[PDB]
C-alpha cells in the first residue's frame, strides 16, 4: 500500500499509547493520594455501624 496508510496508523497508535501512559501516571498518583488521605471511595476500611446502638432508657439515668 501507500506510505500514508502506515503514517496514519503510526499516528493513531502513538496517540493511543501516549493516552495510556498519561492515564497510568494519573492512576498511580490518585491511588497514592487516596491511600494517604482516605477521602475517596477507594481504601475505605469498615467502621462500626451506628444503627446497632440502642437508644432507650437504660435503668440508670447516666447511661
Amino acid at each position: 500500500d501507500g506510505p500514508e496508510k502506515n503514517y496514519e496508523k503510526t499516528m493513531a497508535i502513538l496517540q493511543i499509547e501516549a493516552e495510556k501512559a498519561e492515564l497510568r501516571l494519573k492512576e498511580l498518583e490518585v491511588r497514592r493520594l487516596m491511600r494517604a488521605r482516605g477521602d475517596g471511595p477507594w481504601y475505605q476500611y469498615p467502621t462500626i455501624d451506628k444503627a446497632l446502638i440502642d437508644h432507650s432508657p437504660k435503668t440508670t439515668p447516666d447511661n
Binding site: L28, R32, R35, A36
Partner: protein, 140 residues
Amino acid sequence: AKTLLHKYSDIPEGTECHRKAYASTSIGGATGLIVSAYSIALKPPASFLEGVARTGRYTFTSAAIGAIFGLTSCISAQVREKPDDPLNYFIGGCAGGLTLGARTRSYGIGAAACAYMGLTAALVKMGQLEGWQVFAEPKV
C-alpha cells in the same frame, strides 16, 4: 532492638572511631548471641559446658568481625578524607571477612567472606546514600 542501630547511625562517619567500633561490637555481639541461641535450641551438643563454650565462641567471632569492620571503615574514611564513599565500607567488609577467615582458619572462607562482605557493605552504604528501602512502607 533498634537502639543499637540508632547509636551506630548517630555518630558521624568520619569521626569517633572508638565509639563506632564499640557500636559495631555491640551489634555483632547481639547477632552472635541470637545465632548461638538458635543453634543451642536446634542442636543441643552434649551438655551445659559445651553449650556455653559454643555460644561464647560464636559471640566472640561475631563481635570481633563487627569491631574490625567498624574500626577499618572509620579509619579509611578519616584517612582518605572522603566520607560518604562506599569504598571505605568495602574495605571494612573485606577486613571483617579476613578476620572471619582467620577465626575459621582456612583461606577459602577468608577470601569468600572478604568478597561477599565488602560487596554487602558497599551496597549498604550506597543504599544509605540514595535512600534505598528494604521494608518499604505501603505508599500505594
